[PDB]
Write a protein that binds this ligand. Structure first.
Ligand SMILES: Cc1ccc2oc(C#Cc3cccc(C(=O)NCCN4CCN(C(=O)c5cccc(C#Cc6oc7ccc(C)cc7c6CC(=O)O)c5)CC4)c3)c(CC(=O)O)c2c1
Lengths: 136, 137
C-alpha cells in the first residue's frame, strides 16, 4: 500500500501527448497535454500538492531526462521501474471545447468526481484525501 | 472563508502574471504562470478537478468580463463571488529565495508553492490543513 505512490504515463490524441499520473491506492489522476521539461514541471507541481514518494513509469525515457532527474531530486521523489477510460469521456466532451486541453481536464474532473463504486462509496477525489487523511 | 472557498488573484514578476488560488481555510495555494480569461479558465477547471471548488472570490471585475471563465465556472459549479473576505508577499519572498535554482520562472514558482505548502517545531502544513478540512467533511 501507501499514500504517496504514483504511476506515470503518456497517452496520445490529436497528435498531442497527454501526460497522465495516477495515484495507485486511489485511482485519482491528473493529466496534462504537453518533452522533458514539461514533465519535470508537472512532477514538481504534483509534488507540492500531494505527497509524492515514488513514481513508476513503464519505459526508459524518463531515466534519461536531465530536467526530470533534477525535479525528482529537489522534491524528494524516487523514480522506479514497474487511459482507454479517460479517452471515452474526452469523446463525450471533445466537441464541448475547441481545445483538446479543455477536453482532457473535463474528463479528469469527471473521472475524479464520479463514484468509484458507481453509486455508493467514494470517488477517487474523496479517497486520495481519505487515504492520506487516514495516514496522519 | 471555509468549505470549498478559495480566493483568486494575480501577482507579477519578470514581466509576467502568476495566478494564485488560495484555499481560505488551510492557507493552501496553487499557482500558474500565464499570459493574461482564456488561460484563467484552464487553471480553475483543473483545480476544481483536484479539489472541491464551490465559491471563488476575486477582488476585481476582470473575472466577470470573461466568458471562458464564466463558461468554466458554470461547467464546474463554481460560484464566482466578488469580494475577497499578503500571501503573494510571502510567496514572492520564497520565489525570491529560489529563482536562480531553475531556468524558467514557472519552475521557481512551483518550487515556491511547494515550500509554502509543505513547510510549517511548528504544527501542520498548509498542505496538511486542506486535506484534513476536506476529510472531516
Ligand atoms: C468552458 C471552458 C472552460 C475553460 C476553458 O479553458 C480554455 C482554454 C485555454 C488555453 C489556451 C492556450 C493556453 C492556455 C494556458 O493557460 N497555458 C499555460 C499553462 N502551462 C501549464 C504547463 N506548462 C509546462 O509544463 C512547462 C512549460 C515550460 C517549462 C516548464 C518547466 C519546467 C521545470 O520544472 C522544474 C522542476 C524542478 C526543477 C529542478 C527544474 C524544473 C524545470 C526547468 C526550468 O527551470 O525551466 C514547464 C506551462 C504553463 C490556456 C477554454 C477554450 C476551449 O477549449 O473551449 C475553456 C472553455
Amino acid at each position: 500500500s501507501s499514500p504517496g505512490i504514483w504511476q506515470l504515463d503518456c497517452t496520445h490524441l490529436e497528435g498531442k501527448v497527454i501526460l497522465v499520473a495516477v495515484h495507485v491506492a486511489s485511482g485519482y489522476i491528473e493529466a496534462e497535454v504537453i518533452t522533458g521539461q514539461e514533465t519535470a514541471y508537472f512532477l514538481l507541481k504534483l509534488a507540492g500538492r500531494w505527497p509524492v514518494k515514488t513514481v513508476h513509469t513503464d519505459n526508459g525515457s524518463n531515466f534519461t531526462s536531465t530536467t526530470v532527474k533534477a525535479a525528482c531530486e529537489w522534491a524528494g521523489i524516487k523514480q522506479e521501474f514497474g487511459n482507454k477510460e479517460l479517452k471515452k469521456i474526452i469523446g463525450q466532451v471533445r466537441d464541448q471545447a475547441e481545445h483538446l486541453k479543455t477536453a482532457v481536464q473535463m474528463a479528469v474532473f469527471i473521472h475524479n468526481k464520479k463514484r468509484k463504486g458507481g453509486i455508493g462509496g467514494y470517488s477517487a477525489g474523496e479517497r486520495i484525501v481519505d487515504i492520506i487523511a487516514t495516514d496522519i
